[PDB]
Amino acid sequence: ATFEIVNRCSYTVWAAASKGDAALDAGGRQLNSGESWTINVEPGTNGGKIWARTDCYFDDSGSGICKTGDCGGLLRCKRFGRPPTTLAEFSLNQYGKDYIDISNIKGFNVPMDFSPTTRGCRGVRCAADIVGQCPAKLKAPGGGCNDACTVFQTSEYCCTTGKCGPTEYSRFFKRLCPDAFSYVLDKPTTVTCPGSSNYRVTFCPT
């Protein structure tokens, strides 16, 4: 599958793509404002995620730090990133279907649109000013708006027992971005697309 990752933000982001135990494609790259990066993701990939990282410094070896979404200090991510991170999530070629969503379960850093570029399903977007509106207790100093599980580490926010409800914090994310997951047991906003669709992820779509 082809994903085109586009940075429409006015600032540089460092895109990342991983399935948790491995990079997808090169795993990460710098995207200046307006740049597009096309990656190829193996069919059958389950549990892939794409995100943006902000305020990164890397040396010549590709080692460094980012203020949001750092993946163990590497330019080319092999593992998932540190919250807060708006997530584009996908599982491809799962019994004939691809499944895509946007998640705020690990917080929000950059607004995102995640849309197919082929026929037969709709995209999803979370483009509200979640950072500007973020509750005081969830604001991350480095930038972004943390989820409550990251901040407070309770069974209720992290849904550790597999039973949890919505919370004042989850409802914040859900009010601003209804089409994104706000907590682990949220009513799913997954979209089902034809198997082997292609996609575009746009940072700062509006």
Swiss-Prot record:
Subcellular localization: Cytoplasmic vesicle
Organism domain of life: Eukaryota
SUPFAM superfamilies cross-referenced by the UniProt entry: Osmotin, thaumatin-like protein
CDD domains xrefs: TLP-P (cd09217)
Presence of the UniProt keyword Disulfide bond in the record: yes
GO cellular component terms attached to this protein's record: cytoplasmic vesicle
Family from the record: Belongs to the thaumatin family.
Name of the protein: Thaumatin I
Organism for this UniProt entry: Thaumatococcus daniellii (Katemfe)
